[PDB]
Each structure stands twice: as structure tokens, then as C-alpha cells.
Amino acid sequence: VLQFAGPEPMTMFLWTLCTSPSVLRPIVLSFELERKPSKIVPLEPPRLQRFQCGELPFLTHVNPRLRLSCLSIRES
Amino acid sequence: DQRNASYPHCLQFYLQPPSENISLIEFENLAIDRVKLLKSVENLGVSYVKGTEQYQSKLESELRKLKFSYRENLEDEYEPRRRDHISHFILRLAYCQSEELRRWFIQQEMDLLRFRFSILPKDKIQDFLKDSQLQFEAISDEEKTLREQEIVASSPSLSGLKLGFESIYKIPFADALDLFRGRKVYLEDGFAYVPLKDIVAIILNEFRAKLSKALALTARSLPAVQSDERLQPLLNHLSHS
Amino acid sequence: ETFDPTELPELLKLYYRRLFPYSQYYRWLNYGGVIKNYFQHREFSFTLKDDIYIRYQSFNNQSDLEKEMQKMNPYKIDIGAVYSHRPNQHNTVKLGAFQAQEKELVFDIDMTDYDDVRRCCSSADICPKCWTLMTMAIRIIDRALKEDFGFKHRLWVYSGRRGVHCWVCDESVRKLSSAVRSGIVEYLSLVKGGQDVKKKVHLSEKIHPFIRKSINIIKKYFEEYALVNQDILENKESWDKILALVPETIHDELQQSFQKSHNSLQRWEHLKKVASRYQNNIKNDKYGPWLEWEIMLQYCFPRLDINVSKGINHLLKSPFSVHPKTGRISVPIDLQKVDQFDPFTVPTISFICRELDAISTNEEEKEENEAESDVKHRTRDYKKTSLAPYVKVFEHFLENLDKSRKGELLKKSDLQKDF
Amino acid sequence: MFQKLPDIREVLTCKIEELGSELKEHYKIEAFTPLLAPAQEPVTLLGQIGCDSNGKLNNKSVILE
Amino acid sequence: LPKPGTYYLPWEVSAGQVPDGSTLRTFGRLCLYDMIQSRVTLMAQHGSDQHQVLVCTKLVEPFHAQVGSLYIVLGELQHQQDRGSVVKARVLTCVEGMNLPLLEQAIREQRLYKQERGGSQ
Amino acid sequence: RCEEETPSLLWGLDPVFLAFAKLYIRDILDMKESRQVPGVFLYNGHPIKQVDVLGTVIGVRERDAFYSYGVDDSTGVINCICWKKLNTESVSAAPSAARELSLTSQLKKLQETIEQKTKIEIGDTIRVRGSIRTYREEREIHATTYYKVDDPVWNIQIARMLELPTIYRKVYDQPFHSSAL
């Protein structure tokens, strides 16, 4: 189990692979929305975060992230 | 008579490239033989002083042992001259990568040509000069007497009013660098006046150096096409043997 | 007047704005445009304020060059060699394909190569007594390069403090390789040896014509400069150090003769007589038969630097610069009047700025209601100041170069037989 | 016993080009459209008849090269 | 920083529609390599006519030259007194098997979009 | 009328804010910086923070701490600073068991592959992703990830050039987000 972000030769190899440009590559993804169409629970208001670009933090209203599910992954 | 026409003289400027087909084994053997001859020439030059008798005798023995062309015989000299030509071209192909290798190759070739020229008869020198592209100019006797004192004072291997029975040549000052460097020639309005022996030796050496440098630079553009699977181990081994 | 370096920036700005001859500079550095992209490849290297060094600089045309010097106001300007690509874009070419091709042959002469021969000044100072050294050096080098070699166009530039440069800007000279330049420098040298060697000149029995003519040139200046002004035989230490270059068998005789002698002229005559007498007894001796000529060569011959001329990508100070310490102008030297050239009379930047101010004040009442371009204003400004004869000499040299180019073009047309 | 692929490619290309040029000159055709260029009008193409499989030729597996 | 290399079809370069000093990127098929003077000649066949582009390659040697292969040349155009126009190559890459009609279609699409965007000003 | 920029509070509502935008290099050089927050630019009202470019390397410059490259996209030339990752405290290999030895060999192979992938010279094709910055009155991209594209037939650049106008028309040439409709 590895938790790169969020709240041993094998570990080092996996860590190196997960950050090399061999994985971070352009792909073609066929996805399906995780929240099923039948489900109904719209209750999400916009959040507020503190992005800082020029050593000058500012506040913006951000939308909740999009959750997907994979069905097929192909190279290109 | 293709045999004598192809190789009429022991001395060469290596202008015409070879055009026949040879086996791989002879190719490798010629390359190895010429690199050994070059190393032997360098060692003999460093150990002894250029000239003398022991140095030239050992050089002659080395040339004879490696079945090359050094002397002048009327019968059966096609093979040594052909081997010298092909081996020199192969070594030129193999020695065109870096500046240091080019400088070393040019130095050794110049020394070998100087020796072969020093062991040549006079009429053979004149014929060899005619055969190659060089053309020289001889000043008139009136000019010779007009500038006798200056030439004798410069003393280009001339002592005691030895200007008589000699031909003085007129050449641009950019070609007599060896003599021009250390005040051994009389310079006037952009031309150098040189006696016969010094002019032939030094000017032939300098012209050969310039031509060989230009041709090696031209051949440097070639090995980008030498992707042949053969000749590659030979070139790699010979580069850093 | 004493130069105050704290006033340098304003005078520098005014000089680069109004008095610097951009037109003649671009005319010289272009060579008529016979070859495409010649000035676009010339490499400059400026030194900004507070010792900031930047090289690999190039410009597209005269206006860009004017704008760049006006904006940056450099303290020093240098000229490099012509490359195969624009120097400011030297990283956009595969390594090994960016090499210097052409540069005019140059020479350098300095005081610091005479501190052990001269005594009138101290260290890095100059007095009207020691400028005869540069006069003789100029004459010797110019005669050699004009007769022995045959180089037509030459420019002699006062370095500003203590030296003179020589810009040989012919057509076939620019294409010479490094080996030929090193050969030339070796051909033009006699004083050879390190610091630990006392006798730095060795003359053989046979005398080269170049050395003979140099000696004949030296003799016209040697007496007044050496015996009268320098007084190289005044004290015990003087002839003691001179005695280091004479045969060891006549030390006591020469010392006794010098004690008998009174002035420097008498000592020189006694030395000449002693050398002449000893020359008849020379039989396989280390010392040659030319002691007097060897002494003259050691005490008067110029010494050149091989590093300045051997390289093909070297840098030298450009003409019409400003010395950061004294504040003079690298003015061209006229060859016809090289004897009358007084280094202390070279106009300073402050003096020419004051003259420009006076000229503007006069123009406030003499030249009014004229809507002329800035080019004509700068032309008048540098014409009416003390800088006029030097730009005239520069123009004469440029005219000679233009005549040579026209003659070469005419010869080429004659070869083509088309008119 | 010495063959290289570029030589074979050159020989095949030269044969195809020469025969096609002769045919075009005899039949008075204007130009040959490139194979991969799409168009909505009739076009004249030149090529070599081949098979995409290792088996025998048939009326369903013909490819023009 | 060098000027950008805009695309130009060979029959536009060979027709003198490019001003002097402009930076261009073209394509063609190699035909010759004169090693003595380091000059390369390219043609591209348009319809039934052949147009030539000359490329001076003094800044890219050493070089492996294949006769009959497509090439893409990026450099600056210079007009000469007698040799017409020659491109001083800075980067000369070998591409073989490129779908040329697709490339021309993409070039025309890019030009059309640039014209459309520039039509609002 | 001077078009007032979008308020700095509603910037996050745009989907383009958090995505690596595909833009022409000429556009990257021509967009106007936003006064509210430096380092974030505007294109047709869209607050763009990161970019994605692909082009041909025309110049390589190296310093002690970073690389420099010039990416040419046939529309303009921009610099691309690529920082150097310090290899401090390198992993020490040990003669462990056979499976662990195979794992270490595979790790070394992966390291060699990465080092080969990150080697760039003049004339290659490079893909650069990062954020725009201004330094000494010059606009340049501080690359986050970058690698050398192996494109021997010129299909990737053709696809990019065919695709960019469509994405422009369908996304970037659109008015604004939907903030409280």
C-alpha cells in the first residue's frame, strides 16, 4: 500500500515508476461517470481555496472534482 | 602500360584515389603495416637526429622489411607502390576524427616524404616536380646579380659567393614559412628568394602539408556514411590501438 | 588640467551622443560590402560601469550600433574577429561549427618592456625623453612591414597611456592563419630571453639585411637619446651594469678608462676604441665582433608580444576610446609627422566637452533657425572641436582603402574582360 | 551472396516508374494522383498489384502499392 | 532568439514569393550532395512540374545523406547574385514516409484559421 | 470601453484554470497579464495559469543550476527553463536475494531509460509543460515535466497542428464561465 498524497526495493521501485515519464504519458481513455445516473443527491456548494502563484496568495471559488471510472486504456 | 603509368615514381603526392577491388584480409594487413611503419618512423626520428647515417640506414631497413617502396628499380616495383598508395588512403580514412590524430598523421607523413625526397637523384627530382601540379619560377641572371649581396648575406645554406651555378626561385612569402620563420631567406616586397635545395625541400614539404590537411578535412565529412557493418571493428581498433 | 573621474559619466554620454564618429567607423568596419554579412558577424565586447564584462556582441547596421552605444554608455570598446554566425546567437548552432575566420593583424608595444633599460621615468610614467623609444619602434616596424613584407594599408593608434597599436587591414592579411602570424612575429624579434638572462642579444658573424637596416635607422637617434638625456654612463652603477655585456678580459681596462673619462661621450668613445682594439684579437671567442651593435640593440630595439598576434580570436582596444584613468582619446597617428607627435598634447574628453559647450554657446548667436538632422549636428560638432585632424587622417586611410578596393575591382573586371 | 534491401527497393521503383511513364506517354494521360490523396472525382493511379496475405491471390485481398 | 520558422510550400519558395531574410521551413526530396562545396539540391513534384530548392549545409556537417528521401529544412533565405536563392540550413532532419497531402491540408487549415482570426481586426 | 477583467474570486469556477491549456506560442507571447494577481494571464477572459507546448529545439544553454532551451512551434520562439533535480542521497545497492537482485537490475534499467529519455540536443522535438513567468522583461516557461518526443515520421506534430484550431474554436473562443448564471 502506497499513499503518495492524501489524508524495501519494492517500495523504491514503485516510487520511481510512479513518477518517471514512462507512466506520465498521453493516453486514450474510455471512461464512465462514477455517480450512476439513477443516483440523486445534488448538495454541493462551491469551496474556497488559496492558490499562490506570484508569492501572493489569493482566494478563489473552486468546484468539486470530477470522479470517473475506467473501462479501457490504450496508448497513442 | 598501365603498371608504370599508375606508379611511375617512388615519390607521390597522393592525389588520385584507388579504384580497384581488394579483399578484406589485404585491407586489414595494409592498414596494420602502414600504422607500424608510421610508429617506427616516429620512434626513429625521436631517438636519433634527422640526417646522419644510422638513422637513414635503420629507416631503409624498416621500409624494406615491411615490403614498401623506398628505392628506384626498373623492374618489379608495382607491388610496393600499390601497397603504399592503398595503405596511405586507408590510414587517411582511419585518421580523420580529432585534431591531435590529424596533426600526428601529417607530421609522420611529412617526415616520410622528406626522407624519400632526400634519397632521390636530381633528374628524378626534376621529373617528379614536373609530374605533380607544382610550377616554379626562376629569376633571370640580371636579377640574380642585381640582388646577390642580400642573398649571400641571408645565407640560405650558401657560403662564400656560392651564388654562381645556381637558380634562384621567386615564391610568395606565405609558402616559405619554415625558412621565413628564422631569418634564413631574403624577403623583398612580398616574395622570397631561395636557392635550389632549400626551395625544393621546404616548399614541397609545405605544399604537401597544406594539400594533405585540406584533403583530410574533406574526408572528415565522409565517415558519417561509414555505417557498414564491416570495417567497423577495424576502424574502432585502429583508432585507439 | 587634472582629470576628475567623478565627472566621467556625463562627458562620456555627451561624447558618445555627439562626437563619436559612427559613420567613419561603419565605413571602415564594412569594407565596402563586397562580401555578404561582414559587419553582421563582427564581434564586440563592451565593459559597462562598475566592471561588468560582456562579450559576444554584434549589430545589424549603423543605426542599431548608435542606439546600443547611446543606451549602454560603455567605458571600453573592443573589436574581435569575424565568425561564421552572428555572435549574439552563438548557442543556436551545433557545437564545433562556430569558429573565427578573419581578423586584421595587430601589434602591441608598451613601456613596461623597458623598465630595466630606461631611467628617466619611474615605473609607469612617460616623459618627452622616453617617447623617442616609441618613435624608433614605429619607424622600424613600419619600414619592415612596408618593404620586407609589402603590407599597404596600416593604421597606427595611440593606445592612450603608454603604447601604440598597429592595425594592418589589407585584403590577403585578414585570411592568414595563426602559424603565419607566429612566423611573422618571430621574424620581427631580436631581444629574446627571460628575466634571469643579462645579455639578450646575440649577433652572428653574418648580418641579416633586416638587422643591418634597423641598426642604420637606430644610429640617427641613439646619441641624443642615450648619452645626453638618459646619461647611461653618469655614475658607477651605470657603466657597471653596462659592463655586464662586455668581454670579461677588459673589465679593469674599461673601468680605468671610464675613471679617466669625464662625460658620457668620452666613455662611449673609449668603449668604441676598446671594442675596436679587441676585435683584432678575437679568435674563437663567445663575444662577437659587434659589441657596440649588440649594446645598441639591447638598449633600443622594440620588444613585441607573441600572444597578442598569435591568436585569431583576440581582443584589442578600439580606436577613439576613452582611457578610464587619464581621460584621453585613442587618436590615429600620422606617419608623415611622427617626430612632432606629442603625447601630452592629445585632447582630453573634458577639454573637447568644454569646446563643444563653447561651440554651442556661439551657435546660440551664430547658427540660429536651422532645422538640420542630428547627423549634420554631430558632424558639425566633431568638425569644430579639436578632433578634426584625427578624423581627417582616418578619412584619408579610408580613402586609401576605397582606392585599393576600386583598383582590385578594376583588375577583376580586366580579368573577366567585361566592361 | 551479398544483397541489401535498398538495392531491391531501387530496382522495383525504377521498373515501376519506367513502365508507368511509358504507359502514360502512350495513352496520353495528364497526371497521376497520389494514392493517399482523397478526392470526389475520378482519378488515375499507378501501382503494383500485390496480396496482403501469404496465401494465393483472390478477388477480395488485392492491394495496390 | 531566432525568428520563427513559418511554413512555405516549395512552389511558393521557388516562385520568389518570400522576401529576403525571412525564416522558412520547407520540404523536398534529396537529389545530390556536392561534398566539395557542401550544397544540397531538393525538388518537390507538383502536378507534372518539378521545382528546385538549394540548401547550403555548412552548419550541419558531418552528414549522412540518403538519395531519394524526404527532408525538412529550417533556415534563413538569402538572395545571391548568380546562384539565385539558397537556404542556410540550421536544422535538417530526415523524415521518410510522411503523408504529404495531410501536411498540406494542415498547412492550409492553419493559414485559414489565422486569416479568420485576423479578420476581426 | 476598457474591458474590466473577471473578479479574482470567480477564477476557480472556470474549468480551464486547472487544466494545461494548449496554446500557440504567439498567443503565449501576446496575452495580457492580469493586474489583480501577477503570474496569472488572460486570454478572451479565460484565466490561464499553465500551458502546454510542443516544438523543435533550436538552442541549448546550460548553467550550474538549470538548463535553457528554445522551443520553436512555427509561430514563435520562447524560452523554456528546465530546473535540475539534485540527486542527493543516491540509493545504495546491496547484494540481496535473487528476486531483490532482479528488482535492483530492473530499477537500474528504468533509471537508464529515464536518463536516455531526458537527454536533449539541438534539432530534436520536445514537449514542455509548466507555468508562465516573467524575468527581466522576458516571458518564459518554467517547465514542470518535460521529455524528448520520439517522432520519426512526423505524425504527432501533424495531428497537433490539425487539432489546435478545432479546440480553439470550440473552447477558447467562448465568452466566459457560468457564475450564478
Side-chain angles (χ1 to χ4, degrees):
Chain A
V1 178
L2 295 177
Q3 296 284 325
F4 293 81
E8 189 73 25
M10 171 56 38
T11 298
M12 195 64 9
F13 179 71
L14 286 184
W15 202 297
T16 302
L17 181 54
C18 284
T19 56
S20 91
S22 305
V23 162
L24 318 186
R25 60 196 197 291
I27 53 177
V28 172
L29 170 63
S30 310
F31 70 99
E32 156 196 1
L33 202 57
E34 182 171 274
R35 199 266 327 272
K36 323 173 59 152
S38 311
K39 185 168 284 161
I40 36 166
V41 55
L43 296 166
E44 41 270 16
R47 215 177 69 253
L48 194 141
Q49 219 163 15
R50 54 166 321 264
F51 310 132
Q52 166 203 18
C53 303
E55 287 268 31
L56 193 64
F58 56 99
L59 301 191
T60 47
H61 277 173
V62 70
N63 277 324
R65 281 176 289 269
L66 283 81
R67 296 273 155 90
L68 312 180
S69 296
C70 171
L71 293 183
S72 79
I73 281 175
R74 314 185 264 113
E75 304 290 332
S76 200
Chain B
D1 200 353
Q2 286 202 34
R3 299 192 303 114
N4 266 348
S6 294
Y7 311 118
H9 292 350
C10 200
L11 279 175
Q12 289 174 3
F13 264 96
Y14 303 113
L15 317 173
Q16 299 283 127
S19 57
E20 76 190 8
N21 311 304
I22 63 165
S23 70
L24 209 46
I25 319 159
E26 208 202 3
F27 189 96
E28 215 151 338
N29 298 349
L30 285 171
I32 287 177
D33 290 347
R34 193 146 180 81
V35 81
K36 274 203 288 187
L37 171 61
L38 281 195
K39 277 206 207 294
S40 292
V41 163
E42 163 206 8
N43 260 339
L44 265 185
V46 152
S47 166
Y48 300 166
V49 152
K50 292 186 180 183
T52 76
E53 185 57 36
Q54 49 170 349
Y55 165 84
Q56 83 102 36
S57 179
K58 283 218 192 168
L59 188 46
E60 175 171 0
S61 186
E62 262 315 306
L63 278 163
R64 186 162 75 261
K65 173 208 307 182
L66 295 179
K67 33 91 174 179
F68 275 122
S69 176
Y70 77 93
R71 53 185 151 74
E72 276 197 350
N73 282 152
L74 299 179
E75 298 87 24
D76 192 71
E77 265 213 358
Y78 183 90
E79 274 306 316
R81 292 164 175 189
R82 168 181 172 273
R83 284 189 302 269
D84 173 49
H85 199 177
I86 300 173
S87 46
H88 169 244
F89 265 80
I90 295 163
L91 266 205
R92 160 190 288 159
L93 195 76
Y95 262 76
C96 62
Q97 322 265 20
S98 72
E99 275 295 329
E100 192 259 340
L101 304 181
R102 263 188 265 178
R103 198 200 317 285
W104 186 71
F105 180 60
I106 291 163
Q107 200 79 52
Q108 303 323 300
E109 286 297 327
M110 277 178 8
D111 274 335
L112 188 50
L113 194 139
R114 165 198 301 283
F115 163 75
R116 279 189 199 176
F117 183 75
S118 89
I119 61 169
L120 200 74
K122 313 287 110 176
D123 53 311
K124 308 301 180 141
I125 305 155
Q126 274 291 330
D127 300 345
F128 154 72
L129 257 186
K130 291 157 185 56
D131 279 0
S132 174
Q133 299 312 306
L134 306 75
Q135 195 50 49
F136 284 4
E137 278 66 31
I139 70 160
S140 87
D141 291 10
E142 307 86 285
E143 282 276 60
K144 162 210 197 65
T145 88
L146 201 59
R147 304 171 152 104
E148 163 257 339
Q149 289 87 20
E150 288 89 1
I151 296 178
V152 176
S154 50
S155 86
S157 83
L158 281 191
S159 195
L161 195 58
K162 212 49 198 70
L163 197 55
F165 318 109
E166 293 292 326
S167 70
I168 295 292
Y169 288 89
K170 198 158 191 169
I171 49 157
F173 90 107
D175 299 331
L177 179 51
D178 313 327
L179 313 172
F180 153 70
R181 174 175 312 238
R183 277 183 290 274
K184 284 183 284 296
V185 64
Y186 175 68
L187 279 169
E188 192 176 349
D189 55 72
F191 289 120
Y193 301 119
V194 196
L196 197 140
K197 41 175 88 65
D198 282 332
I199 191 94
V200 278
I202 286 305
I203 300 321
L204 278 161
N205 276 17
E206 210 279 339
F207 194 110
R208 146 82 159 173
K210 205 149 63 53
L211 211 39
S212 191
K213 178 51 186 304
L215 189 50
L217 181 31
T218 284
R220 164 52 280 191
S221 302
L222 208 49
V225 82
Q226 294 313 108
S227 312
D228 208 317
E229 71 166 10
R230 325 170 275 154
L231 314 162
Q232 189 170 359
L234 173 55
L235 281 168
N236 297 346
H237 158 269
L238 185 55
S239 57
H240 60 80
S241 292
Chain C
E1 205 268 335
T2 58
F3 194 50
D4 198 0
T6 191
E7 306 148 354
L8 192 49
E10 317 318 296
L11 317 159
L12 260 175
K13 174 195 291 183
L14 193 47
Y15 169 45
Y16 282 142
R17 174 67 182 283
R18 313 264 296 283
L19 298 188
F20 195 94
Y22 297 113
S23 188
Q24 268 70 14
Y25 215 65
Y26 180 50
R27 263 184 78 206
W28 166 37
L29 275 178
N30 191 25
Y31 295 122
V34 284
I35 295 171
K36 191 81 184 295
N37 276 346
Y38 211 104
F39 181 64
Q40 273 81 14
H41 293 190
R42 190 63 77 119
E43 161 202 27
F44 295 82
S45 75
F46 306 123
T47 290
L48 299 182
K49 192 191 176 292
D50 300 333
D51 288 9
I52 291 179
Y53 192 66
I54 48 150
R55 50 179 303 164
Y56 290 134
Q57 298 284 303
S58 60
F59 308 110
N60 315 292
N61 51 64
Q62 163 180 279
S63 181
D64 203 0
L65 169 68
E66 289 180 54
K67 185 158 91 204
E68 270 313 305
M69 278 186 221
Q70 280 156 358
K71 173 173 155 321
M72 261 184 328
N73 281 299
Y75 280 66
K76 278 197 271 285
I77 307 173
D78 312 304
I79 300 180
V82 171
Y83 287 77
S84 48
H85 206 57
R86 293 171 169 223
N88 47 4
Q89 316 175 354
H90 66 104
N91 53 2
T92 83
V93 165
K94 170 177 71 51
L95 187 52
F98 181 79
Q99 288 169 348
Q101 290 201 321
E102 304 176 14
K103 187 178 92 81
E104 323 93 7
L105 179 56
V106 289
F107 290 109
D108 197 357
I109 310 166
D110 206 311
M111 281 305 98
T112 57
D113 302 336
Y114 301 87
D115 274 333
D116 56 316
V117 181
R118 71 185 195 129
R119 302 155 42 226
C120 53
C121 299
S122 56
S123 294
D125 307 330
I126 48 157
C127 75
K129 310 201 257 193
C130 48
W131 201 249
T132 315
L133 278 185
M134 301 305 78
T135 301
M136 309 205 287
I138 279 181
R139 269 162 180 278
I140 292 167
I141 291 311
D142 198 78
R143 177 226 82 87
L145 289 178
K146 182 166 73 67
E147 294 160 1
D148 267 350
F149 284 98
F151 297 148
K152 297 308 174 210
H153 318 97
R154 297 169 308 282
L155 193 87
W156 285 95
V157 162
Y158 173 47
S159 89
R161 250 263 304 267
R162 303 160 306 179
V164 285
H165 297 109
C166 183
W167 292 83
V168 178
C169 325
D170 268 336
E171 216 293 325
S172 59
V173 177
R174 288 198 300 280
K175 309 166 164 67
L176 293 181
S177 71
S178 301
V180 186
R181 298 178 204 238
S182 292
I184 281 163
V185 168
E186 190 163 356
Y187 171 88
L188 276 175
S189 283
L190 284 188
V191 182
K192 302 173 186 176
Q195 188 269 333
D196 303 310
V197 188
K198 308 308 281 177
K199 178 147 182 68
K200 295 174 182 178
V201 173
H202 295 265
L203 270 188
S204 69
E205 294 82 22
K206 199 167 273 288
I207 278 297
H208 199 273
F210 163 63
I211 299 180
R212 177 172 51 89
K213 296 190 182 173
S214 299
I215 279 296
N216 297 359
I217 286 177
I218 274 188
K219 266 278 202 187
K220 294 168 179 55
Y221 297 92
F222 175 63
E223 171 183 0
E224 183 268 340
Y225 159 76
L227 321 175
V228 175
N229 299 334
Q230 286 294 316
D231 203 354
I232 56 156
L233 291 151
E234 180 210 339
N235 57 66
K236 174 72 178 145
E237 195 262 358
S238 60
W239 57 65
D240 274 1
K241 86 167 70 64
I242 284 181
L243 207 75
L245 322 168
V246 305
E248 293 169 325
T249 67
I250 49 190
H251 290 179
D252 301 334
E253 184 181 5
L254 277 172
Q255 211 283 149
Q256 188 46 52
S257 204
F258 290 165
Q259 274 190 350
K260 293 190 293 289
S261 317
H262 305 85
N263 52 64
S264 281
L265 273 155
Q266 282 177 222
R267 284 161 193 117
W268 191 238
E269 295 312 304
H270 273 273
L271 187 31
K272 286 176 39 168
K273 295 186 289 283
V274 163
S276 182
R277 173 218 39 82
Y278 181 79
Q279 198 175 339
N280 307 356
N281 300 324
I282 290 180
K283 287 296 298 298
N284 305 345
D285 198 4
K286 176 179 66 178
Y287 303 86
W290 323 107
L291 274 298
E292 183 191 20
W293 290 2
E294 280 180 328
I295 291 155
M296 261 185 298
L297 284 180
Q298 188 151 358
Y299 258 49
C300 290
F301 207 80
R303 292 137 193 166
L304 320 172
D305 190 5
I306 193 169
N307 282 319
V308 195
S309 304
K310 173 180 53 78
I312 210 174
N313 61 339
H314 205 262
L315 294 164
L316 270 193
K317 176 174 288 201
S318 158
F320 291 109
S321 294
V322 170
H323 213 303
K325 286 175 174 64
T326 75
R328 316 187 180 278
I329 299 299
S330 296
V331 295
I333 278 187
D334 201 344
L335 282 180
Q336 318 301 320
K337 290 145 275 279
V338 79
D339 278 332
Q340 293 86 17
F341 181 72
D342 197 3
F344 300 89
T345 58
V346 160
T348 65
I349 176 169
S350 63
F351 173 74
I352 63 177
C353 279
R354 217 70 37 77
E355 281 190 323
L356 176 57
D357 284 336
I359 282 154
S360 280
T361 311
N362 293 318
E363 283 164 344
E364 279 142 32
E365 284 90 3
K366 296 162 162 291
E367 282 282 339
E368 278 284 335
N369 316 300
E370 42 104 20
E372 262 180 18
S373 60
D374 56 345
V375 189
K376 311 194 217 209
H377 206 296
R378 294 159 213 186
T379 313
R380 290 191 172 185
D381 286 329
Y382 87 80
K383 268 178 190 161
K384 274 189 280 290
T385 44
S386 285
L387 219 67
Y390 306 137
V391 193
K392 177 57 200 73
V393 165
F394 206 117
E395 190 77 34
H396 164 240
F397 162 54
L398 286 185
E399 281 156 339
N400 270 319
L401 254 180
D402 264 325
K403 269 178 236 187
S404 288
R405 271 167 287 176
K406 285 168 70 66
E408 281 190 3
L409 269 168
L410 286 163
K411 289 188 290 291
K412 284 148 214 168
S413 182
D414 298 328
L415 290 157
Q416 295 152 311
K417 210 149 197 190
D418 279 330
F419 316 105
Chain D
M1 302 146 210
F2 193 62
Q3 269 204 113
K4 293 197 296 298
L5 310 188
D7 305 332
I8 305 175
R9 184 212 197 198
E10 202 70 46
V11 166
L12 294 185
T13 281
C14 271
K15 172 246 282 186
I16 281 180
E17 269 155 10
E18 256 168 41
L19 199 47
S21 177
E22 288 277 320
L23 258 175
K24 162 212 198 209
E25 195 273 337
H26 178 95
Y27 269 112
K28 280 294 150 307
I29 321 158
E30 305 294 331
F32 292 132
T33 305
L35 285 191
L36 307 170
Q40 313 108 320
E41 280 70 27
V43 285
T44 290
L45 317 179
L46 172 77
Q48 188 180 244
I49 290 293
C51 186
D52 68 332
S53 87
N54 311 351
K56 294 209 178 217
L57 196 67
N58 58 72
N59 56 350
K60 300 182 289 287
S61 68
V62 176
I63 48 168
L64 184 82
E65 209 154 10
Chain E
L1 289 163
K3 315 192 73 55
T6 44
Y7 278 96
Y8 278 104
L9 305 180
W11 46 90
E12 277 163 297
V13 162
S14 177
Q17 296 192 319
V18 170
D20 275 349
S22 312
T23 315
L24 47 89
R25 198 188 322 198
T26 70
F27 47 84
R29 203 167 283 274
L30 195 137
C31 170
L32 190 133
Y33 187 25
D34 165 9
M35 259 164 144
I36 312 162
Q37 328 165 28
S38 67
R39 189 167 312 247
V40 175
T41 312
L42 317 176
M43 301 146 258
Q45 164 197 148
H46 173 253
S48 60
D49 313 278
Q50 301 219 329
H51 320 265
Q52 289 201 0
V53 188
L54 280 96
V55 167
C56 171
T57 77
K58 225 171 291 194
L59 306 175
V60 308
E61 320 213 319
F63 198 22
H64 185 27
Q66 289 150 339
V67 186
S69 301
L70 265 161
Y71 275 106
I72 279 185
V73 50
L74 158 62
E76 170 156 18
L77 187 77
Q78 294 185 333
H79 265 195
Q80 299 202 323
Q81 196 62 260
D82 299 334
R83 271 72 59 197
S85 57
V86 55
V87 162
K88 326 290 280 292
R90 275 199 270 116
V91 166
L92 185 62
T93 49
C94 168
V95 294
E96 172 78 51
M98 215 202 333
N99 174 327
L100 276 173
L102 212 51
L103 185 60
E104 301 146 90
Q105 182 204 324
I107 285 172
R108 257 151 311 110
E109 175 98 19
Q110 185 194 83
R111 276 161 175 190
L112 186 133
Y113 176 63
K114 279 306 192 162
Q115 268 183 32
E116 185 301 350
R117 181 143 78 109
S120 304
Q121 288 189 0
Chain F
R1 194 254 290 176
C2 190
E3 281 87 5
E4 179 177 355
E5 311 179 5
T6 58
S8 69
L9 274 178
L10 312 186
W11 273 355
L13 298 180
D14 264 305
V16 197
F17 199 89
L18 318 165
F20 285 101
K22 301 167 176 53
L23 286 149
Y24 285 114
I25 280 187
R26 173 52 48 182
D27 265 325
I28 287 187
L29 300 172
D30 273 11
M31 313 148 32
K32 167 180 72 71
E33 205 168 22
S34 177
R35 273 83 51 85
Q36 282 104 14
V37 168
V40 158
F41 296 75
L42 298 185
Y43 172 80
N44 199 8
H46 286 262
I48 287 184
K49 203 174 73 171
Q50 309 151 269
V51 281
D52 186 326
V53 299
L54 174 82
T56 326
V57 175
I58 62 178
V60 168
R61 183 158 79 86
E62 175 153 10
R63 288 277 307 261
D64 49 13
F66 64 92
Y67 288 77
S68 172
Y69 300 107
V71 171
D72 194 332
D73 200 0
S74 305
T75 325
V77 172
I78 202 172
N79 268 327
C80 289
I81 292 305
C82 299
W83 289 109
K84 266 199 274 191
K85 297 280 106 174
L86 287 160
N87 293 350
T88 319
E89 308 146 359
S90 48
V91 170
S92 299
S96 296
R99 303 288 188 86
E100 288 203 32
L101 276 164
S102 173
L103 274 202
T104 49
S105 67
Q106 270 198 355
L107 190 139
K108 257 70 176 176
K109 185 255 209 175
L110 190 68
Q111 291 276 5
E112 181 267 340
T113 293
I114 296 160
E115 297 286 351
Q116 171 197 267
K117 196 76 147 154
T118 188
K119 178 175 307 307
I120 291 160
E121 60 212 28
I122 292 177
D124 287 338
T125 290
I126 189 182
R127 178 196 275 285
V128 180
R129 300 166 146 267
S131 48
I132 316 174
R133 288 297 152 75
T134 299
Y135 183 79
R136 293 219 165 82
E137 310 188 24
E138 282 199 333
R139 202 161 302 191
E140 61 192 18
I141 296 179
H142 287 178
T144 287
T145 171
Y146 74 114
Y147 49 94
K148 162 172 65 181
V149 162
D150 43 356
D151 169 85
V153 182
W154 266 56
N155 266 334
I156 307 179
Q157 192 157 357
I158 276 184
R160 169 65 157 258
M161 168 193 323
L162 273 171
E163 164 222 309
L164 256 179
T166 294
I167 208 147
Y168 261 57
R169 290 163 156 146
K170 266 184 201 50
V171 184
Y172 296 146
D173 284 356
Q174 300 283 305
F176 81 128
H177 31 275
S178 161
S179 188
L181 267 302

